[PDB]
Design a protein around this ligand. Sequence first.
Ligand SMILES: O=C(O)CCC(=O)C(=O)O
Ligand SMILES: O=C(O)CCC(=O)C(=O)O
Ligand SMILES: [Fe+3]
Ligand SMILES: [Fe+3]
Lengths: 558, 558
Amino acid sequence: DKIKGMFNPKIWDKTFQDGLKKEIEDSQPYNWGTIHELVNDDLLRAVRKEIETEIHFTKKETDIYRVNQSGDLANLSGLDWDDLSRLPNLFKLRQILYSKQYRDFFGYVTKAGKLSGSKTDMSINTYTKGCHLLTHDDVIGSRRISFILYLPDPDRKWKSHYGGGLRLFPSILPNVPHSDPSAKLVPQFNQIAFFKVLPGFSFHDVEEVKVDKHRLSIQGWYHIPQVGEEGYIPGEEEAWVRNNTSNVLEDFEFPKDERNILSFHEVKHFEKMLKVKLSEAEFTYLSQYISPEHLSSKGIEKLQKQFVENSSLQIESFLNDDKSELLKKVIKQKELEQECPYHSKDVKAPWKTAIPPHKARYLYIDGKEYRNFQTEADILEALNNNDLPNFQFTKDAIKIISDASGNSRENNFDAELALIDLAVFHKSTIFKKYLALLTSLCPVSEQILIRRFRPGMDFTLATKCRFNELLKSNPDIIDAVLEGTLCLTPSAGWESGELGGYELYMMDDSVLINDPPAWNTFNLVLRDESVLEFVKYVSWSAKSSRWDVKMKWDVKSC
Amino acid sequence: DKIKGMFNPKIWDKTFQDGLKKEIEDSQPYNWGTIHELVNDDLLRAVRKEIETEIHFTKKETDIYRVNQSGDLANLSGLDWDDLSRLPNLFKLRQILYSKQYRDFFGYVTKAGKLSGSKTDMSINTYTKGCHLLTHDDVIGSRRISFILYLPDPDRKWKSHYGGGLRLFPSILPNVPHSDPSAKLVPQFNQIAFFKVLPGFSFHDVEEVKVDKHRLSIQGWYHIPQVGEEGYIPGEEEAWVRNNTSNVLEDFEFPKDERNILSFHEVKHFEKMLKVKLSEAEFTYLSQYISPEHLSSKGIEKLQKQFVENSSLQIESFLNDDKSELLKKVIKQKELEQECPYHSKDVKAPWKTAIPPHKARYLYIDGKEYRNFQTEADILEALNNNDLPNFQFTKDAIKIISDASGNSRENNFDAELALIDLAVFHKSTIFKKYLALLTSLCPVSEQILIRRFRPGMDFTLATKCRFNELLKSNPDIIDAVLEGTLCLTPSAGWESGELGGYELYMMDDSVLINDPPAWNTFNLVLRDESVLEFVKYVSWSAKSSRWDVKMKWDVKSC
Ligand SMILES: O=C(O)CCC(=O)C(=O)O
Ligand SMILES: O=C(O)CCC(=O)C(=O)O
Ligand SMILES: [Fe+3]
Ligand SMILES: [Fe+3]
């Protein structure tokens, strides 16, 4: 048997097979398996060499990933699955993996039943330093089992600190993965990792590659049997796709994309002004935080003109010298002298973790009562007991925790307190008057968040604004959300190192803004329904978190 | 001189006059004066006797006062200012008070200028136990100087503990009086108190009469001179009335009549249900606070029917036995064993004082950061820095104050903590689902306040609901405010003693609800634009404060 002989002879042994089936049954957080030294060593070495000589990889980055790919439609990479003339060993590899012999073995140990021999579905990718793939479940089309065969250097050990681990996530509920993974597989040459595709459950990701090494892999899927194949059931595939394609789940997303309506006093002030002038006292108040260049008569005129022309502002050195210096000092001190929580269970007041991880992950201060979501019950409690932001109470709580601890260089809340003070400034009636002056728009609601995006952990994905549905019938209220981001990231290397963390606004060139983290910048965007936004995953190589203050307002023409 | 001789001879003495003018100039909180032994003693004694024999007084109560009056249009009291046949001494008294001789004296010492001799304007009233007159400024029509001549028993001293003091209020700003008075005059027979009417400033009230005594007085006004009189200036009166008749001041009112919009999760739950059923788990949650009789299938059906027919509910024994007993214990303990603040400066977290006192006075917990409004600056700071309610943070702050003090029978916050727990129950998603079930209305916003109305201090006046102006164009949102009051007043005697504190709803029989304070009642009223509501001034004779929880929701047909 020329097929059987191209695999490790152990895989044809009944005792081995039963042992592996048991391993898979007993695995966590959902059923998965691995086999070491799977394929004939000479064959797999020859495949690696063919790939190196015949395939050219191209970096592709999206919100969800950065991966060096070879699957371009025109086959300019050199990989054409319809014509493997220059890769005969790869041809042999695909043939043996989709053989009846292997499929019968593989379907048995995974309890997946019959698998398609003809619907071959493989991809060849490399992950180099900074490459990653964020949380997802693989539930697409007729996929039945996911597999990844790893081909890093056969004569060197791939090490845990290299990154590139396959990580698997437990679930709080179906389609609601826990923020932190519970298993990690470190890939080696000729090792295969695999799992039955599980709608709602099979959440996994590829840990960023943290060093200058090349993680080469062949990712594939076994599919539901097709017409004329063993195990084919007419209608099975159609039913599977339908049941996986066909908004209760938004309840499990935190923070909520919700704004609170402003006071009668506030709205009157904005209306009165826009039906042109700030008092000297009001300018004095603004000058406590904002640079003089953005408060001068001609500075304001320029900003007003820019907003009219672009429906956005990108302001540099937004905060004045005093506040910029204060914030830089306290943020740098926290970055360099304090320990950051790197698991949601370890996050303490005033911080929360954005969830679920197939949508976002980051730390935030919202001014609401402390939440740490580890169980379904924790989430249900929050939903039954909505509370509203209160930044002064949050400040108060911080002082009491701090005074109990001693307020040292290791545990002080100087950064959080300074950032909350900044949030309170932006919550002030006078700030919103200034915002109204710049935009000729009348804020009627607000949400303010302080965010920290940790290296190797944090990101958001491309999403649209959420309109205040109670305000939809109001003809004065514009069909848009005004969104501000005050970036306070003190480290460098973001652009040159491609460290992620950039704020991206695009139309659904479609890119409106692509802004790597910087220090003391203020972005303002009037978002209509279609505009997409995200903050890119922050690389482990970043020398600080991305820190910012995120602000959102419903607005009326005034 | 028959006129001069009917007054104390001292008032015609230049040295006396100048001394009095100086007293008035140097007085606080606004210029006022008093003269002792003003009138011929025999004359004033004869006037008192005529009043006792010839005038019948009738108790009249409104939101602002309770006073035994004699000014009925038909003159059934026996007092007819056009025919004093049976009161010739009263005739003589009016004549001398409006004489040129007296007006020249009175106008001089008050720096009020000329006064009308013909536009006589007097009223005769008695204040008996429980009678009072709340804060007001006397600024009506052509009134120039206010005076009150007191005629209690001439042969007994009126004592401070009798009450019935004339109290004068300082101002934070024009038309914004301080909550607490800064001067009090204790009336005696033949004593006159007076002040120039001052738009924006001349705020005064009559302290409740606290004992079974009869405070008889003649209140009057001197007016701007009329045509043909000394000092008449054509157009003066018209200009005065115009400048006093012709909404910035709502900024100074606390608490704000403002509701916060509910979460997306909440509104979805109500919509889903009303487009009929609560789960067993939801009933279990409700049963923690609410009596079984209001959660049963037929109990609910009855309430639903009552609300359909009346657009209101009046529920007795609302809370279950466990919670009723807990709340009664802690409220009674606070009433009987702890000291209540009786000046706004003495009110501490978590309590605030409703202001200004010509509109309302009471203590409330709103869950917002602590405020104590003693200056204009204090108010302006709050207005520039709006914050939102957070009951858990309020609870947290209470524990830290309590643990610093020792948590004794004298200083514990057991009542406040139990009341906040109750507020949190009513803030729960499941409670609002139950509310939606009872009413077939869909809450979309909320405000919850805990209120304490102290004996001898606290009240509100008749006002309409305030619509959420941002929601006016929404056709689904009903032009009404749903309003709940959970009364938790543990003392008795309210109705029999006429102790005030009643909750009054009336159409602008017009009375919808007149409900004296009781224990564990829940009133629910769907208020359209016109419906007026107030809580009547609580008598010093009440044996506890009125305690309640006030709830307001915007609602849609769902
Ligand atoms: O390379 C891996 O380990 C897994 C890749 C993956 O999950 C995917 O491409 O869907
Ligand atoms: O009787 C008093 O002392 C004052 C009465 C009063 O202020 C009034 O009737 O307007
Ligand atoms: Fe995958
Ligand atoms: Fe008065």
